[PDB]
């Protein structure tokens, strides 16, 4: 068969003789079936069913309210900026997150054991949090490497949000300025929550009052990168 | 359609996986190394094995270099392990030998050297047409 052959078979022969009556009776039994599903499903299937029915009820209420109310940009922009996807756009020099959970050295570092004996040497410490190592990085030789910052935990970019512009851009990390838990964590370059980092802001296009281009600014990390797999930061503007 | 034929009575399977059998056709191969048997079931540690009239998958260990790189379907036509027919005869051939075929059972070569078994001849009509002696 070719093209719309089921529709052509419908046109030439119809359906089964009881199709309309069976469809009407099933649509009539739908209410009892839905109540039975609400009262008799179990577990994760019942939880997903309840969430999905909650969604349908909210949507139906919105549609009914809109039909009830049937009988009744924000910032000024130039004409060439009309009909475009524009952002909503929403002394004490305090940062947005002035206090975070402190990280103990036991949580920060884990002991790496060395040696072939049953009793092992334990002077090496591995950093368990994400780090930034900077440019032109070459690792220390293994005999003199106390702090291990593993390769798979090293980051170079961050999703940085500008509070005024309501714009999030991925920016390169320039340095790590202050980890609030420890100056040693600052020196190791640990990226945890509340850490002040320096970011390349060339993409944001920031011009100073004297006409110079600002390409380095400070941002505070606002998430838990070891849990999230990424670095989220907010510019300090 | 998988290559295990239907209507085959139970017989003793003399050739497990890893057996090197002779090549009874003129396809250029001289021996066949069995790596699998069509229709073999699932049992812990049991080697899949085949008998006369069974389809196996085989690699060529000796012969033309063009056949050495492929896994060919083959039909076992002769076996040396004695087996019984329904007429009560226990019988065996002097060697183990098979012929290279396609999945449809048609032969790759054009001639068969030596005799073939009744089971192989009855299950595969192309082997029956290419058989000089059927024993």
């Amino acid at each position: 068969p070719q093209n719309e052959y089921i529709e052509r078979h419908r046109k030439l022969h119809g359906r089964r003789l009881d199709a309309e009556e069976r469809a009407r009776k099933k649509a009539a039994r739908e209410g009892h079936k839905n109540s039975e599903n609400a009262q008799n499903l179990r577990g994760l299937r019942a939880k997903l069913y309840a969430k999905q029915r909650h969604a349908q009820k909210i949507q139906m209420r919105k549609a009914i309210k809109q039909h009830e109310e049937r009988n009744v940009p924000s910032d000024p922009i130039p004409s060439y900026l009309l009909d475009r996807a524009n952002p909503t756009t929403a002394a004490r020099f305090s940062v947005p997150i002035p206090k975070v959970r402190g990280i103990s050295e036991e949580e920060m570092f884990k002991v790496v054991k060395t040696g072939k004996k049953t009793h092992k040497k334990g002077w090496k410490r591995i950093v368990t949090k994400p780090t930034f190592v900077g440019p032109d990085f070459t690792r220390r030789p293994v005999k003199y490497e106390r702090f291990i910052r593993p390769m798979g935990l090293r980051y170079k970019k961050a999703n940085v949000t500008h509070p005024t512009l309501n714009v999030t851009v991925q920016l390169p990390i320039l340095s790590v300025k202050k980890n609030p838990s420890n100056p040693l964590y600052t020196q190791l370059g640990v990226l945890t929550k509340g850490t002040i980092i320096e970011v390349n802001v060339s993409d944001l296009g920031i011009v100073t009052a004297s006409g110079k281009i600002a390409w380095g600014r400070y941002a505070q990390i606002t998430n838990n990168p070891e849990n999230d797999g990424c670095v989220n930061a907010v510019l300090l503007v | 359609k998988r290559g295990a034929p239907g209507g085959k009575l139970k017989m003793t399977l003399g050739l497990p996986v890893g057996a090197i059998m002779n090549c009874a056709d003129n396809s250029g191969a001289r021996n066949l190394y069995i790596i699998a048997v069509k229709g073999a079931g699932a049992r812990l540690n049991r080697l899949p094995a085949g008998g006369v009239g069974d389809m196996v998958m085989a690699t060529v260990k000796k012969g033309k270099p063009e056949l050495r790189k492929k896994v060919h379907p083959a039909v076992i036509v002769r076996q040396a392990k004695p087996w019984k027919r329904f007429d009560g005869v226990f019988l065996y051939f002097e060697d183990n030998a098979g012929v290279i075929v396609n999945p449809k059972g048609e032969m790759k070569g054009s001639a068969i050297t030596g005799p073939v078994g009744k089971e192989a001849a009855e299950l595969w009509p192309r082997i029956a047409s290419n058989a000089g002696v059927v024993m």
Partner: protein, 254 residues
Amino acid sequence: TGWKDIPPVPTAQEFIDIVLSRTQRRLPTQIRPGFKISRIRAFYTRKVKFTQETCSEKFGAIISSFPVLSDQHPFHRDLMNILYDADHFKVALGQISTAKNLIETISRDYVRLLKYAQSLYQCKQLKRAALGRMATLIKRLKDPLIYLDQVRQHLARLPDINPTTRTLLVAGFPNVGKSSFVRSVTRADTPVEPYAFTTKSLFVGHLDYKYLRYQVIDTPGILDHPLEEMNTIEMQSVTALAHLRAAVLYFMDI
């Protein structure tokens, strides 16, 4: 042969539900905080890898089943372009391949992080982050999946036309008797009606002449205006006439 063996293309929400239900039900779900950290890492790593493998299998099945436009005969390539915009076809399949690649990249990154995670809570957060990022990537594919499902159904119902056989190509104006002739000489069920453009797609029937199989192609009608003013329905007939080495039968109603 045709394109009836393309697997069905789910929507984005159905795709997410299928993949996450496979991960939930084909793997163990119970892990304890008191277990060894290597055991917990293996559990969550297996979750991430299995989710990515299911996504990769489904996306590769979608990609490898659809026709490759550059590998078709020019008749089939041009007809596919007339039926569905070839730019849209290639863009949808490219988005599918890009999403598959991005999901594999996300899986590799989060497996690498789970190598270094230190607690069940951190492992759980990393696994949820990986799965949620895959779900966001799939949610971004809502419109290409709908488009590809429609195209798959049409391709499955497309007639099989051999461009390198004996073919009789029946063409002409609407309402001149093309479908009547094809019905009279073949077994094809092409409708015959008095209104114009009754036939909106290519139909093919077959006949035997001197123990040889001939195929006969019924076309939609063609109007008298330049090529830029033809719609897709007439452009199917124009494509067949341009690319099929056939015997053309131009029908006239005097």
